[PDB]
Amino acid sequence: GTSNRDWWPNQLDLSILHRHSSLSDPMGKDFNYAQAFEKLDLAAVKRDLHALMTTSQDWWPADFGHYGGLFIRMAWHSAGTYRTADGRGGAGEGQQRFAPLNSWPDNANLDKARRLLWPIKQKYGRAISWADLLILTGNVALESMGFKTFGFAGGRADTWEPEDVYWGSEKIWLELSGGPNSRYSGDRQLENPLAAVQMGLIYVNPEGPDGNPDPVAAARDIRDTFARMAMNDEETVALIAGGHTFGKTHGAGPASNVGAEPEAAGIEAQGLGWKSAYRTGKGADAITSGLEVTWTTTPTQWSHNFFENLFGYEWELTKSPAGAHQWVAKGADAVIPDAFDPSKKHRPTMLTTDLSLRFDPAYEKISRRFHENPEQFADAFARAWFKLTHRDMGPRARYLGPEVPAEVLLWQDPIPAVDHPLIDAADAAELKAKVLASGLTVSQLVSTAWAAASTFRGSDKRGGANGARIRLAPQKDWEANQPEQLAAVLETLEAIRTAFNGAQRGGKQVSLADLIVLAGCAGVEQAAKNAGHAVTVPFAPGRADASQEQTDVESMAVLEPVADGFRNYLKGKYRVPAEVLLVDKAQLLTLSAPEMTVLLGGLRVLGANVGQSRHGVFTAREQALTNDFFVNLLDMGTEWKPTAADADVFEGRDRATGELKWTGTRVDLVFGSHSQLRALAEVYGSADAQEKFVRDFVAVWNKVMNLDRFDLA
Amino acid sequence: GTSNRDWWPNQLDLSILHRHSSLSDPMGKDFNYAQAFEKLDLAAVKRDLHALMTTSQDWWPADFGHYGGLFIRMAWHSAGTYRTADGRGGAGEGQQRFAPLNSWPDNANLDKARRLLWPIKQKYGRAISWADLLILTGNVALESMGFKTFGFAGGRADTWEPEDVYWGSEKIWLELSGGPNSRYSGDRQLENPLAAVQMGLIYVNPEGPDGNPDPVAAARDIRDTFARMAMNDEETVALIAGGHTFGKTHGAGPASNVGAEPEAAGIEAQGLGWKSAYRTGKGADAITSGLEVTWTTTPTQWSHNFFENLFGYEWELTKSPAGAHQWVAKGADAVIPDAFDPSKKHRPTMLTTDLSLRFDPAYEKISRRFHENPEQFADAFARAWFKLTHRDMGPRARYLGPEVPAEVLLWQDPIPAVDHPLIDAADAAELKAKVLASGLTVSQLVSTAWAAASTFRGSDKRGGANGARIRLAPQKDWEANQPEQLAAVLETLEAIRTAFNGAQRGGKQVSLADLIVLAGCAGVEQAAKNAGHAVTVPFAPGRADASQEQTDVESMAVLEPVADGFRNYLKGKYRVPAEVLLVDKAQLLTLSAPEMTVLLGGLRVLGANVGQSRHGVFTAREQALTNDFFVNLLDMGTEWKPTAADADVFEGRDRATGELKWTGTRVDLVFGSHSQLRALAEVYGSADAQEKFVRDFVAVWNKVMNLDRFDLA
Numbered sequence A, B: 001g002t003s004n005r006d007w008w009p010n011q012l013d014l015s016i017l018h019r020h021s022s023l024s025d026p027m028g029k030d031f032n033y034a035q036a037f038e039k040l041d042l043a044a045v046k047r048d049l050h051a052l053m054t055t056s057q058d059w060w061p062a063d064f065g066h067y068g069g070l071f072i073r074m075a076w077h078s079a080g081t082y083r084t085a086d087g088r089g090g091a092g093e094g095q096q097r098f099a100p101l102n103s104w105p106d107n108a109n110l111d112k113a114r115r116l117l118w119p120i121k122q123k124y125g126r127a128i129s130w131a132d133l134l135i136l137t138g139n140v141a142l143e144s145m146g147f148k149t150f151g152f153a154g155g156r157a158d159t160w161e162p163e164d165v166y167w168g169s170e171k172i173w174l175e176l177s178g179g180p181n182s183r184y185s186g187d188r189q190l191e192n193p194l195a196a197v198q199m200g201l202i203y204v205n206p207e208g209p210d211g212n213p214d215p216v217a218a219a220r221d222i223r224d225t226f227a228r229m230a231m232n233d234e235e236t237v238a239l240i241a242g243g244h245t246f247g248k249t250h251g252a253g254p255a256s257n258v259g260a261e262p263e264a265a266g267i268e269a270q271g272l273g274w275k276s277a278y279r280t281g282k283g284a285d286a287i288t289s290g291l292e293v294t295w296t297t298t299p300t301q302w303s304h305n306f307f308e309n310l311f312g313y314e315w316e317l318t319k320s321p322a323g324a325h326q327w328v329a330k331g332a333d334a335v336i337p338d339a340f341d342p343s344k345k346h347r348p349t350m351l352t353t354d355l356s357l358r359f360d361p362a363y364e365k366i367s368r369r370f371h372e373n374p375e376q377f378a379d380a381f382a383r384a385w386f387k388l389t390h391r392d393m394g395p396r397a398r399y400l401g402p403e404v405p406a407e408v409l410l411w412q413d414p415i416p417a418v419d420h421p422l423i424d425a426a427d428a429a430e431l432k433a434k435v436l437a438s439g440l441t442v443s444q445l446v447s448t449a450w451a452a453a454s455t456f457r458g459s460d461k462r463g464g465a466n467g468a469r470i471r472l473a474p475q476k477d478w479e480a481n482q483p484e485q486l487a488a489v490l491e492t493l494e495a496i497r498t499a500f501n502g503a504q505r506g507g508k509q510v511s512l513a514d515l516i517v518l519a520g521c522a523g524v525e526q527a528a529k530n531a532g533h534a535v536t537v538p539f540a541p542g543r544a545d546a547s548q549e550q551t552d553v554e555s556m557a558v559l560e561p562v563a564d565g566f567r568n569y570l571k572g573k574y575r576v577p578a579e580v581l582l583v584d585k586a587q588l589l590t591l592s593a594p595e596m597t598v599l600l601g602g603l604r605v606l607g608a609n610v611g612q613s614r615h616g617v618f619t620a621r622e623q624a625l626t627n628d629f630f631v632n633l634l635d636m637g638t639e640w641k642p643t644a645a646d647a648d649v650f651e652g653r654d655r656a657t658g659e660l661k662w663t664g665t666r667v668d669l670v671f672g673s674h675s676q677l678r679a680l681a682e683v684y685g686s687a688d689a690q691e692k693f694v695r696d697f698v699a700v701w702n703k704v705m706n707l708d709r710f711d712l713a
């Protein structure tokens, strides 16, 4: 069946902006997951999950009689696809149940784990999503086995189709580095935005880098991949040691026994995969990773035995029954219990990646401290497990149910509670007039508010204008934000705010976060008036100002835009074409193709480009809100060519005279090239479309201003 | 970027059901194209188009000073992708402007024709769709050159993304037959549903079959492909002769001069392609097909010179400047004008496929009659051109504006006007009660109404329950429709109708087409009652009964379902998996994945399977409307295996006892295998879902009942 993707594999794919339509969603347009979850009897759900832990099913018998380890690994993998670079992956959409993650090699047999949860899912129905259930089940596993969690928030709404995520370019599962589509270059540099060492792994290879069983080298990969999942050294050691306090791995026989992954299995397998011809195919004969390691003397109970073993023995390199590299404790007694046979015991074993916690010098010091102070280990793991499993849930206002921790954590980019009356519509009109009387231009007001709001990404629900973090390090210094002009605009807004707030009775005040947005609205109003349209822009108050100490500077670096097509900004020269980067950004902002089109066309004419660039400013009435961008872009009286100096900048000349009319980047011209985008630009560039352009612009502007406003949801 | 399609190339692609969401649509959800078109000043549009015809642009100079020929070929190609086998292709969605059709080799330089129309599109905006404008432009071309068209209907709403259409399996444009993905097998049998001889052609190869310049052989491809586009011999000769009365081909130099098709061209080309390094690249130097033929002495005026030349000279095999086979008149004077140089003239030329009209014996008699009687030629062509360009527009109720022809054509599957009062809601309740008192079962009433309504396909908007054609040849004899049971149900319904209609005052009556649907509604209400739910199934009267004499039997053959997963029906053994056929049918019925899921699950338990098969009937309360399908499908207590006798039927056995519980086909079990479908099935199989399943079933049943009801749009 030959498709457009086969004929034109490097054309832009806009379908990624149109996933998650109401067409694929089986719930009404009215279904609100938060409200269904708020009625769930969470306690009853936890009781059922507690019972499930030791209700072994014959089609996938429970190791040691307890599914706890399996469910902790299930939950860890649901969370563990998260990348800080784009905020994609993570547990927040329940994507583990869809392709490709349902069939990743590292997710082998987690199909069985999710099938075990079906009766509970079915019983509670829409009131608990798969996405919430997977994490809750991890929590309950930990609790069942004697570990007290830091807490749990519901509110991860289920999704209904696979996300479009760049997981790499390799065409072979688990391909080792240096192939034709290598994710590594230079001195083992992993390409952004990837956060795993091989296609179909979560973070690293348990045998060591590219299969080489060097724990020191393995530590380097661990540290890099975990940093790319937002975890520092302490959190990392706590998570790995904490997780490998429980359960075991499965490699009872050769991996050639294991058949097709779920998405490749036959229809009779009913959504399950990795069927094994080794012996009974399950239980004591299970093959998952190929490794055969049990870490502790009590695999179904919280202990301090991980670090006791890690430091208490010396380790020797050996092989699992499947042929995989792993480590066995030299001269040890058989103290580890067998998962199925009460008469067999085994020597302590470890993976290469466990030994990393000992033999990397920085990890070693943390592992020692946790060894000597187990209460610090327990607390670090609890905190890290909460972080891991909630990292992509967004602001605290989205957290539901009775187990939400009251402690506010730095990584949540917290926003202070509003404790005063908010501005009303009269106050908003007075502020907007003061803004316009101060001398700030349309371009300044629009650029500033765009800069503040457009850090939001729906992937992990970080960023947005709430908080006024654009006035703090590091946002205030980002090149795309034009630090010098930004400083000037903020100093003017701050004087307006000080004066308005000092005039108030009764505790009313306006936050700078609100005023930045409100000021951008005034700029759009002014621009509409410059074009002869009478427009009021909607504005919702209630944003607050976060302090510098509430803003982790390092964590904030990943939100820096290195490409923002909306401002015609590229930080350097990338191997990814700019128009691909524009679509990627539109996706993070939750924009459809029509929204992205109208938005960019308006921003160009309002003066939002970085550095006052003229590229794509296809108008003679800059700072007026018109559809000029489109009308001029589509004018066949102009011919375009890439410039001598740069293949990425284009000159548009009068076809008859050869005179230069405009210049543009690939981001500008793509709207006139791509057949679906051009169809959109046409709508907005038609003679009957001036009002529609202004109205659709206002609506999309307001949408971007409100992206993070979960306090109103 | 490696995708799910790369890893699992034979998994089902559900995205095809979720195109044309509101997300991709730049118009408000309120936009009604029909109402915008009805206020268009169509006369003013045709005046602008008329002026455009002879206003040559230097970027693509008009041959002979007139764009007419170019626009006729543009409109012919817009329409000429149509296939009767699935109704896909055609002009009715304006898909020529999107991938892949925008870049087919046969559509070369029609990018220039569409660009020429941009000023007029831009002037009239949303009041005329691209889809309508392409056809109108061809009409105006013909009119400006002296040809009287049979009429024009507007109402083709624009679309905003490529359709997913199977155009063949070849991986090389224009691949010759007999390759690894050959569309031909046996004695030159073209695979259904294809209607062109090579990938990226409209119908046939202008040089002859696989490039072999034998007009006799070419005539066989012409006849086959045109029949597959719903054209008989007379229509075919009229179309080809009629078209090639105008304009010329373009092959001024070697084809190697011609660059990338639009979807492959650089961003600077702004949506145009096939840029030519040959001399000026355009005009007198134009290269399109590679052939260099001008058919008549007045290429910008309607004439009967095509047939005068065809019969008046003898023809010699020759080559264009690009190397293509074509024919030149032996010993002729230079009587054909040059497109750009008034001092240069040329001999008559023909394509191999033109000579087919003379040298095929059946075409020859038609071409002679048209030769001797050009008034018959003009009338046949007018009629054929109307048919061609409207074939996929659907019922007459969708035809808009002031040039709709009053004559009703058999190919339109016409439906008589309703001339009497319609039944009201109390009448509908009395009819439903009489239906249920007659002893027709839930199963019979549902099967019958499904059989009648489910012939509809949104691709060409043919079929549906309006007309009561299920009582007529050939529908009454299709094996899927269970002819003997159908006859029994219809006889009972007809006696109820005769008695209701005989009791009325005031000319009120009910059509059998309405009653068949209404009776299906009664079946579903009774099924819901059997499960303890009281619902009313909505019903809209106003269908009418068409006669046998108003039903072209041969044209109706292509609507026969050979695969209907909704009735668990497959007519024979196909190369395509049945679950793929199910998705194909869902797409033709305009169903989303959730609608297809709910609908199939309900139809199973209502007894809609052909032949009373138990396959997929996963309930112990058949004829009760419950969600049993899903609850039992998803029960992990049952294990499934393909049967000894058949790899396409499966047995479901109790996992503990080995007892046989159910049987199912691939269509049944796909809902428990495919990860996106199983996520849907889960919603409907959850303990809180019984009411939602009934509500969603009823809505989708009603939707299918109404698919053809453009009289209410």
Ligand code: HEM
Residues within 6 Å of the ligand: A063, A068, A069, A070, A071, A072, A073, A076, A203, A204, A205, A206, A222, A239, A240, A242, A243, A244, A246, A247, A248, A249, A250, A251, A287, A288, A289, A290, A291, A353
């Ligand atoms: C360097 C990072 C990590 C590596 C390379 C790694 C590797 C593995 C491997 C290969 C398995 C065996 C899979 C099998 O054959 O069944 C496994 C099991 C497991 N891991 Fe990890 N792991 C890592 C981090 C984590 C973390 C962060 C957690 C949780 C906080 C976790 C919890 C588990 C648990 C509970 C199991 C046991 C599964 C069972 O009992 O069925 N691991 N790990």
Ligand code: HEM
Residues within 6 Å of the ligand: B063, B068, B069, B070, B072, B073, B076, B203, B204, B205, B206, B222, B239, B240, B242, B243, B244, B246, B247, B248, B249, B250, B251, B287, B288, B289, B290, B291, B351, B353
């Ligand atoms: C067996 C069927 C047909 C074949 C193989 C065929 C082939 C061709 C070819 C190869 C060209 C030249 C393209 C170029 O180099 O610019 C052409 C031109 C043309 N064809 Fe057809 N054609 C067929 C049927 C039709 C029909 C059904 C129509 C309309 C009723 C039509 C109308 C035209 C016109 C108007 C042109 C002139 C283009 C211009 O003046 O720029 N043809 N045809």
Ligand SMILES: NNC(=O)c1ccncc1
Residues within 6 Å of the ligand: A088, A089, A163, A164, A165, A457, A458, A459, A587, A588, A589, A590
């Ligand atoms: N792959 N996922 C995203 O790009 C995304 C998800 C949710 N909202 C916005 C963006």
Ligand SMILES: NNC(=O)c1ccncc1
Residues within 6 Å of the ligand: B088, B089, B163, B164, B165, B457, B458, B459, B587, B588, B589, B590
């Ligand atoms: N390829 N196109 C179709 O299958 C279709 C188009 C419009 N409505 C329904 C089905």
Ligand SMILES: [Cl-]
Residues within 6 Å of the ligand: A088, A089, A090, A093, A095, A163, A165
């Ligand atoms: Cl994602």
Ligand SMILES: [Cl-]
Residues within 6 Å of the ligand: B088, B089, B090, B095, B163, B165
């Ligand atoms: Cl189509």
Ligand code: NA
Residues within 6 Å of the ligand: A087, A088, A089, A090, A092, A392, A458, A459, A460
């Ligand atoms: Na995410």
Ligand code: NA
Residues within 6 Å of the ligand: B087, B088, B089, B090, B092, B392, B458, B459, B460
């Ligand atoms: Na069609």
